[PDB]
Design a protein that fits this description.
Chain B has two helices and no strands. Chain B is mainly α. The longest helix of chain B has 7 residues, at 41-47. By secondary structure, chain D is an alpha+beta fold. Classes of the chains: A mainly alpha (54), B mainly alpha (72), C alpha/beta (266), D alpha+beta (118), E alpha+beta (152). Chains in contact: A-B, A-C, C-D. At the A-C interface, loops of A face loops of C. The structure holds magnesium ion (28 copies) and sodium ion (2 copies). The structure holds four RNA strands. Chain B: Belongs to the universal ribosomal protein uL15 family. Chain B: Mg(2+) binds at residue 17. Chain B: This is Putative 60S ribosomal protein L27A/L29.
RNA sequence: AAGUUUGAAAAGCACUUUGGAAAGAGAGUGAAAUAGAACCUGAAGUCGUGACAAAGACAAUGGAAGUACCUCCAUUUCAAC
RNA sequence: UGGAAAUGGGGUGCCCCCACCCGUCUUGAAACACGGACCAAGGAGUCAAACAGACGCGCAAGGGAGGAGAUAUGCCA
RNA sequence: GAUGUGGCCUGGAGGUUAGGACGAAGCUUAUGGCGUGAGCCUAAGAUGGACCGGCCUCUAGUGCAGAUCUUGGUUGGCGUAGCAAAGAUCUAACGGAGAUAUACUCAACAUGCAACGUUGGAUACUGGAGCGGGGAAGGAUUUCGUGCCAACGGCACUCGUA
RNA sequence: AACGUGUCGCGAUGGAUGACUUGGCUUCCUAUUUCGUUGAAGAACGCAGUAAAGUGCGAUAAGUGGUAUCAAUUGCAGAACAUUC
């Protein structure tokens, strides 16, 4: 049976999942802490380079 | 966690709670919201009154910031 | 995403006395006509291949994290809980253990070891040292060769010092400004053995606040109120006030004898 | 250092000839350590060693070959007989032997000067 | 471990064996088993008479739909044959065992066979061609033989 | 398809003898050859051999309760106990 | 105090009695209904997203992010 | 068909507590003991040779008798069906380990059979639209000499396009 | 009797299991980082005292020159600046 549930609209009918025949269309954030570290390091290096300017 | 699911309890039952007669087939009633007026009409009418039709005027380019108005 | 599916396999259909599984095309090799594309076939694709967008990480409420840290710190000050967790504290002078702050001026591991022997943490250090061994199972081939127990944790007020303590095997170092629950309750069990310096011990009150004064560091945080004012319910149950209102004890029937009782009226 | 056991082992067993020379080092005697203040040196042909581990423990002889392809050295006095009566040498890993007298050349003396701990 | 059984007295026994003989295992099984309890000289006479076709080898286990003969009556059977390739192989094995006994310093006229065992060895593969373009196995089945004898 | 994964080290079986040879019987190396060369461990299934149990034709297997014979198994007892 | 006795297990045979071949679809199988020569290794309710209910935990007329930054921090995803 | 279980079992992680060259894992069983049961534990190995058990949490590619299931191996049928188109070989001497190969008795037969290459004789077949002598397509050392007989020439070989 | 059946000790055939792992898969980072008519990628044929495949190389052919190092390479030949030819 189905019963009393919300009518679903989940919007996943395109080839988004990478499989044996599809490249997929996805974006993950597994590099977030590394990129945060890189940005802070770049800011510190740039400040050292342009010292004493703000 | 996989160790709390019904599959672990059903190992050895050969049918996993879907019956010998009806069985577990692919799509026995169509996919998604199909048949809302034909063979799912009772469900749609008793649980979701007002799903079908049109009502009211249209507002083409809605901007919510000019409509912001909270109350206390 | 391509593993097990890099073949041009097709089913032979019925009419040949073989199963309907897809089979490798071609000829001239031992793999010609063999099964393919199936979780039950040799060289086939696994069932439900694993993906990288599984939920690996978790969110936790900030207040719940702070509550857990507070509970671990409170448990670390009960000597019976520390022994139950498994640390060897039999010659320790006092729990919580607080020492002078001059240890930050050490420069030699020999001096650090002398201090540990004086403070009597050497028993736990020796326990950790003697527990070292090679890991059991597959983990020894995956850069997890050795395992050992957890020893005492020494808390410092800042990042200075620690030069003479870094190489001592079986001793952990912590900073009072960033206390870690994974180190305060290893394996999910409370009761870590902690050695405090005077400066960090004094900073604790300002860091964590009291029941009535908010923390200076954690904005708008106070210690949770207890559910019970006194947690000794046995004393309450045996107090005179309760015994005054308890129901009286009555005399019961005598215990049945060894002989069987009769049941035949006629 | 190297947190990968797989990478550490690959570098050891695929090392070139000049890297295997350093890996096949032996400690010096107490008398030689006092004289040069050096704990260990790579083994060289025409050196004097004494065996400290294994069945040939206590034997003495002169190094005749550093094979470097089988990770062994050959000593003249360490040998055994075959079935037909001939004599063959037995290889010993350099970390089991101890050097008792160094073959000194001009380049060798410069190396000892570099590694002096004083 | 070499032999499945051990002689009662080792100093008065001789042994012999052969591996991967390249004779039919079923034929060699019947040929070797018939001499299990016989004296050495009596066993050698029997093999000579089989080659002359005056006595036969009884086939007791692997005998499905073979011919009947009158020479099988002395063994209490009705089916027997004269496998010459197995016989000459067993003749050589007895000579080797006899040579071992003489080297020890025993009398070959006083020796009795006490142990005979024949086992299947690894097979060799050829092919044959059938109707409708089919290819079907065409295999060979060699055998292992071991024995020892003791002096009476 | 296919780990050449013997052994710490080839020390990879000199020599006697039977055989055309393959090999067998001795001897020897090695802590082990039950580690003898694509040689660590060496399962299941199937087969050979020795000893024993018997057994008609009820296809065989199976249950329940006894008995005959065996038992490299366990526990208990061995003195006014 | 023994090559001991006794009581339980274990093995093989025998006697009297009892006893249709497993899995499956089916109203109905033992069936003249289908799949079934033997063994080893492999083999099938999973991951993600939206919603709801029951149960556990924190706070409460408020609850909570996310993205990002800052410095302990330059061992530490 | 639903639900419960300080219910059993498998690979890995955070803790804690132990074991091992006086022998870990794995493997074998007329080795008993325990549990209603999934299973757990001990004994023996005249097996093996270097790792690994219990308990509390966490985690998952986590339990097989059958899918005309997949891959590898084995197996009764079975020494069975058969190895029947193209007429065919016989003899002596050389060669070869391939023989005239024996315990007693004994003259020889009735106790070493069967099979092979070369040469000389004999007897046959192909019958010039030939199992004659040369080429194209295709093949690519199959050509020649010496040696050798593990596998291959569906029987055999001392022979061979091996 | 014989064939056949059953249990135990030993032995064959067979290659599972355990332990091992210079391989795979997945996730991050660094930078003076992106071929060719000045003939590339790919294809062919050759080269060692002994050399089939593979690896390296091109008639200067398992390689010439330079810097560093510091005594081998090895199945067997062969050769023999150490001040580093
Ligand atoms: Mg319904
Ligand atoms: Mg259900
Ligand atoms: Mg249905
Ligand atoms: Mg695969
Ligand atoms: Mg017939
Ligand atoms: Mg045919
Ligand atoms: Mg072994
Ligand atoms: Mg083996
Ligand atoms: Mg077996
Ligand atoms: Mg029945
Ligand atoms: Mg019907
Ligand atoms: Mg049925
Ligand atoms: Mg009927
Ligand atoms: Mg059907
Ligand atoms: Mg808000
Ligand atoms: Mg796994
Ligand atoms: Mg049994
Ligand atoms: Mg699975
Ligand atoms: Mg299975
Ligand atoms: Mg026939
Ligand atoms: Mg015929
Ligand atoms: Mg025919
Ligand atoms: Mg004909
Ligand atoms: Mg003859
Ligand atoms: Mg002739
Ligand atoms: Mg012609
Ligand atoms: Mg043939
Ligand atoms: Mg030129
Ligand atoms: Na569904
Ligand atoms: Na003519």
């Amino acid at each position: 049976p189905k019963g009393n549930n919300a009518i679903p609209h989940v919007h996943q009918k395109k080839h988004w999942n990478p499989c044996s025949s599809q490249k997929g269309n996805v974006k993950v954030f597994l590099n977030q802490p590394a990129q945060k570290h890189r940005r802070r390091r770049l800011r510190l290096l740039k400040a050292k380079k342009v010292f004493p300017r703000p | 966690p996989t160790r709390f699911k019904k599959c672990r309890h059903q190992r050895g039952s050969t049918f996993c709670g879907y019956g010998r007669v009806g069985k577990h087939r692919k799509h026995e009633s169509g996919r998604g919201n199909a048949g809302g007026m034909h063979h799912h009409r009772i469900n749609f009418d008793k649980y979701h009154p007002g799903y079908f039709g049109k009502l009211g005027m249209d507002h083409y380019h809605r901007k919510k910031n000019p409509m912001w108005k909270p109350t206390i | 995403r391509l593993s097990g599916m890099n073949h041009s396999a097709h089913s032979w259909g019925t009419g040949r006395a073989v199963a309907r599984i897809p089979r490798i095309s071609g000829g001239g090799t031992s793999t010609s006509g063999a099964g393919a594309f199936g979780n039950m076939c040799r060289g086939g694709r696994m069932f439900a291949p694993t993906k990288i967008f599984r939920r690996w990480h978790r969110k936790i409420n900030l207040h719940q994290k702070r509550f857990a840290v507070v509970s671990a710190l409170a448990a670390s000050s009960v000597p019976s809980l520390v022994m139950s967790r498994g640390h060897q504290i039999g010659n320790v002078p006092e729990v919580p253990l607080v020492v002078e702050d001059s240890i930050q001026g050490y420069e030699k591991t020999k001096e650090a070891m002398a201090f540990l022997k004086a403070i009597a943490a050497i028993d736990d250090v020796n326990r950790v040292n003697d527990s070292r061994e090679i890991r059991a199972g597959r983990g020894k081939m995956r850069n997890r060769r050795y395992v050992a127990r957890r020893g005492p944790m020494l808390v410092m007020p800042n990042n200075k010092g620690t030069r003479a303590f870094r190489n001592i095997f079986g001793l952990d170092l912590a900073n009072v400004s960033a206390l870690n629950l994974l180190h305060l309750a290893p394996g999910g069990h409370v009761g870590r053995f902690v050695i405090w310096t005077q400066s960090a011990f004094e900073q604790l009150d300002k860091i964590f606040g009291t029941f009535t004064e908010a923390s200076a560091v954690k904005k708008g945080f106070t210690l949770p109120a207890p559910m019970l004012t006194n947690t000794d319910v046995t004393r309450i149950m045996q107090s005179e006030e309760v015994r005054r209102v308890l129901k009286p004890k009555k005399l019961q029937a005598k215990k049945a004898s060894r002989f069987q009782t009769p049941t035949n009226g006629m | 250092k190297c947190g990968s056991r797989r990478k550490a082992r690959r570098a050891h067993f695929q090392a070139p000839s000049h890297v295997r020379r350093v890996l096949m080092s032996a400690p010096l005697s107490k008398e030689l350590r006092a004289k040069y203040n050096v704990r260990a040196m790579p083994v060289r042909k025409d050196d004097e060693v004494i065996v400290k581990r294994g069945t040939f423990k206590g034997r003495e002889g002169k190094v005749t070959a550093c094979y470097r392809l089988k990770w062994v050295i050959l000593i003249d006095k360490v040998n055994r007989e075959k079935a037909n009566g001939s004599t063959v040498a037995v290889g010993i890993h350099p970390s089991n032997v101890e050097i008792t007298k160094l073959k000194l050349t001009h380049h060798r003396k410069s190396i000892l000067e570099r590694k002096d701990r004083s | 471990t070499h032999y499945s059984r051990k002689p009662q007295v080792s100093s008065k026994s001789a042994k012999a064996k052969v591996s991967d003989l390249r004779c039919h295992y079923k034929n060699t099984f019947e040929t070797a088993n018939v001499i299990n309890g016989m004296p050495l000289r009596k066993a050698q006479q029997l093999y000579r008479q089989v080659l002359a076709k005056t006595r036969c080898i009884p086939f007791k286990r692997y005998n499905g739909k073979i011919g009947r003969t009158a020479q099988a009556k002395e063994w209490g059977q009705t089916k027997g044959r004269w496998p010459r390739k197995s016989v000459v192989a067993m003749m050589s094995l007895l000579k080797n065992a006899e040579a071992n006994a003489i080297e020890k310093g025993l009398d070959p006229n006083q020796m009795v066979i006490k142990h005979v065992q024949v086992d299947q060895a690894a097979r060799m593969r050829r092919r044959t061609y059938r109707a409708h373009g089919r290819i079907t196995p065409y295999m060979c089945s060699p055998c292992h033989v071991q024995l020892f004898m003791s002096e009476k």
